[PDB]
Design a protein around this ligand. Structure first.
Ligand SMILES: C[As](C)(=O)[O-]
Ligand SMILES: C[As](C)(=O)[O-]
Ligand SMILES: C[As](C)(=O)[O-]
Ligand SMILES: C[As](C)(=O)[O-]
Ligand code: NA
Ligand code: NA
Ligand SMILES: [Zn+2]
Ligand SMILES: [Zn+2]
Ligand SMILES: [Zn+2]
Ligand SMILES: [Zn+2]
Lengths: 352, 352, 352, 352
């Protein structure tokens, strides 16, 4: 079968691979709709998580089950499924400790396009179908559904990690697709005022649509100073980091009140260190809690997010700015994430 | 000054009292708008919290500050304010332990119409103005603003106590004004499917507007059996109790999954005991956690909720079904909570 | 093979059963040391969890692995293991939402002597060996080790559920072996003053050894009134219920401060309802949170508690008051839990 | 009156100051025993929190109340009291948000020797006596009692911030007096194995007495690799940072499991930034939560810790390695903290 792969750091292309076969608890799935992710640009071009060889890329798919192992009970060939980007091994110590994302090691719940061939292939393999797939309701269109595996779970996790309480004033730094979902997530965890820091007009407009109340752009001066002025010197209660770089944490610390939470979901692609400023972190003692976490996955997380879409709590379709057709256009869509035009949030390729 | 009071158990009427004077940290406030509460019906007619003598009723007001003590810094005469129903003494052990609602004893943060003359007077006294009052933005109409002191804080607290997580299926039992705010709260804390248990047409319609997906009317059969049928025997994830009686807890336990939370905010007016069914509670071991809590108050809670209204997260004006003009209509408005007509949710009295 | 079984409600005896065989992920284990539990008295004689027919009793064992399935990686024949009383199916929805105790339904993580033949047999079956067995260090004697599967995990869970904070004043109601572990648990979760409610001299003496500061014997007065007197009317911060009956919760509510937690681990064997007193529960609003939960199990919980014993944090050997040898004494040891002589805390039977 | 002061950065000496007078809610206290702190060395010699002019030093005292304001109810002249190092203004927004340590701004609950004349004077001022003093039981000697205001509360807070769960393997980095109390705190919060990182023999011996199981001395090699070797490559569950410098955080991240907590209580005296290593932090996504917080204070915290000492949970007397008498020895004791001889943990000066 054909797949679109990281050949090595800095190099992508189409390769031929054996079609995978399922173990007793697994499923083979063919993609119906897929999307590319900024994360794959960090992995391939920055070597952010080390060298790889002929690794099929992609970790955002809606699919059709085509084969199941003998012990799969809840899925059968023909079933349309939402495939989470995180598909843990559920029988590990990390799961017993409450961190399925790190099942088998740090980040190891994230298999596709990290430590396993991803979804940009004629077929792909899902470990533990019954634990790691969700049925797709017919009422949710493919374009919307493909935002669930990663964009929605990750953006919402940013809000979760930021420990948002009812009425909190929140700043989301970074309003690409993840950060837009963090704006939506903050709104769905009861935030009051929501600042969104971004620069591209279309992303700022969609941030308002998802519940941002204040757009903060760099043309009006230092963004920390703008947020301090806007809050009468008080700062914000909670910060979500959904973009930027290793230096964004310093900005979050400077804009946030003592006794607070910074929730990072950005994959940091370069730089040896994240710098936390000593004085503004209260010389070690300001209770400015710092969190940074990989998104939840598995069946239940998907079912929860599916319900949010089904019951019209969140409409992730606004993230999808470009749609193409056909296997060949996986390459086109991927290259769009690399050189992002000013109108891009997320591309989707429909295969069926 | 005139006030509308609990004369003793079973008896209300107009009385004359001395106008209060502030201590150094206090404010005297004149009401601009007030509302009556079901809780005062429990207190007066069921004697649910003991005997009282000539206690001015009411604990829901927006007002104008008319006098402040010498040590008040943040409020001045002329300021329009939202007055929380709960106005704690902030310098107590219970505050140091994190429970301002019980500062000075169980329920003792709730002063107005519990242990102190309430807001149905020409003036009323607010202890610790700087800690208890919040500024009212001019943009919020009086009718909406007077839903903030009690209805919003209490309904939202039901959702908070219910430990709602993203995508949870929630049942709110009781959709009077508090329950309607619990539906809104559940929506704002990331609930997916939301069942609302009620039978009055107008209340049920407003529940849908606040985010209820399913209305459960007891006239169509045992509400527990309806919810189990609707959830294919699985039950709901979390329950808010915002109405009913001491027997409602058993219903909550029977409809909820093991490993779950029941958040009560209903003031229970009668009955020796709340009965929790042994077998359905997992013979002591089902992790069906039971919570019951007085609403938060103080300045910060009010400011948080004012932000939710200001930034258009929640519109509590839908609760207001009757608007009366003039101080004398307090009596008429109160007597409507006693004999609840089917089109009533909450009355408001706007003062001259 | 021979096993000691519940024949039906009210009847026990030795029976012959099929020696179990393991699936690919399971182990067959022979007991090296076992103990009987009060819970099996509730199940057999009170019918507390329904009828059973020929169900081998017991759920507290250290064993020797004798056979493993083809997919078991971490355990081999000959390995000495601590077997948790709770051995969940790890691939369920309840596990994905953080409640392994209820995997597959309420209480369903507790298999042995609930929904599966227990450990009082020549052999028994452990589902998912790699997730549900822990290696026994040679330095821990068998008599101590057999307190880990249930007594330590349950008693400690009571303390966990009680949400103990450093310096809290705690009351543990009931000082059988579980309650003695709750006293120890409270001590290792930072309690200051610890009241222990009991009246049997040897249990009271052991309670002092595990950290109780005050013994509360009902013969000296109403236990709630004693605790109120001792705390100058303030009550206790947190309560663990580890014994008593359905009426013990009312005592906990009456002795505890508003804004608090009651952690129940007692298996309630009789009575329709647990009565919560309406007035002393703050008429629905006192923030007296009520918890009741089945003990954790699985491998990781066992390893954690093994560490507590190995590193000399807790010595559970003090619970063991009778040591017998051989299968012939399982029945004797079991009947001691039915008819509790005054010197008894927990018997252990060591097998050849 | 005389006091021992920071004259300016790098300079200390005795100065004359006006004897303070109390407001209505305050007390004037004369010290009976005091201790110096490493924090004052950072403040004076490193200029860690900026310039000061004639600020009396010291924030650890047991005292005799000599004067109270007219509104003080619970304290009177003659009363012996434990004075917390943190004495918040309790009537602030930060208190309503649950962070009394930051009442009136970051670190502003810590007044003595930060933003207020400290305890190394003939008298000192305590704001809000009823909220910020605790009675000293006669059964606790002065030397032990003077460990409660800062060493116990801080060290225990490190363990609290580290989110320790029963049986967790913990590493405490730094075993000066605060770190020794973190060891004791970890022990009290249910830790299993406890590593203590330190090299001064007497501190290491005392660490074992407080519950450390393993001493890790940097002279034997990279402490991270020592910990990885000891944990079979698994890392520790939780880390407390109670010493070191800005670079210690990187060590904590490298030794800890994904899905974990680092609780810092070290006052960081120099260095612009705390560097968090990107790769070992899971490229932003490892769930290695970072906390850094000022100790709790006020009356309730002191009463909690007094109970821990009174009921013989923790004996802080082992921290006191040097006792002197008289004001003339405050300077000597202070200079011990700068030049740390090998036998020093904490000095105490008894004044009465
Ligand atoms: C699965 As990801 C690190 O791209 O959110
Ligand atoms: C202040 As109330 C008990 O009526 O929510
Ligand atoms: C496993 As049990 C309910 O006896 O603690
Ligand atoms: C009050 As301190 C910063 O020395 O622990
Ligand atoms: Na109060
Ligand atoms: Na302060
Ligand atoms: Zn991605
Ligand atoms: Zn009310
Ligand atoms: Zn048992
Ligand atoms: Zn200090």
């Amino acid at each position: 079968m054909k797949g679109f792969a990281m050949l090595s750091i800095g190099k992508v292309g189409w390769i031929e691979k054996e079609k995978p076969a399922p173990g007793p608890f697994d499923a083979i799935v063919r993609p119906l709709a897929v999307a590319p992710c900024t994360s794959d640009i960090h992995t391939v071009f920055e070597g952010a998580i080390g060298e790889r060889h002929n690794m099929i890329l992609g970790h955002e798919a809606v699919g059709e089950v085509v084969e199941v192992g003998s012990e799969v009970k809840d899925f059968k060939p023909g079933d349309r499924v939402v495939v989470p980007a995180i598909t843990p091994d559920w029988r590990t110590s990390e799961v017993q400790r409450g961190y399925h994302q790190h099942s088998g090691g740090m980040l190891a719940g994230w298999k596709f396009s990290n430590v396993k061939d991803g979804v940009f292939g004629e077929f792909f393999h899902v470990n533990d179908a019954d634990m790691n797939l969700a049925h797709l309701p017919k009422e949710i269109p493919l374009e919307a559904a493909v935002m669930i595996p990663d964009m929605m779970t990750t953006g919402f996790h940013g809000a979760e990690l930021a420990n948002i309480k009812l009425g909190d004033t929140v700043c989301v730094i970074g309003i690409g697709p993840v950060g837009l979902m963090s704006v939506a997530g903050a709104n769905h965890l009861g935030a009051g005022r929501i600042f969104a820091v971004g620069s591209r007009k279309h992303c700022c407009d969609i941030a308002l649509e998802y519940g941002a109340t204040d757009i903060i752009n760099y043309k009006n001066g230092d963004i920390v100073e703008q947020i301090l002025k806007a809050t009468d010197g008080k700062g914000v209660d909670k910060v979500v980091i959904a973009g930027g770089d290793v230096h964004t944490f310093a900005q979050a610390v400077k804009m946030i009140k003592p006794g607070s939470d910074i929730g990072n979901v950005n994959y940091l692609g370069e730089g040896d260190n994240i710098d936390i400023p000593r004085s503004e972190w209260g010389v070690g003692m300001g209770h400015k809690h710092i969190h940074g976490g990989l998104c939840p996955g598995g069946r239940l997380r998907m079912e929860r997010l599916i319900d949010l879409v089904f019951y019209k709590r969140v409409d992730p379709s606004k993230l999808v700015t470009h749609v193409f057709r056909g296997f060949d256009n996986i390459e086109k869509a991927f290259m769009l994430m690399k050189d992002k035009p000013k109108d891009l949030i997320k591309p989707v390729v429909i295969l069926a």
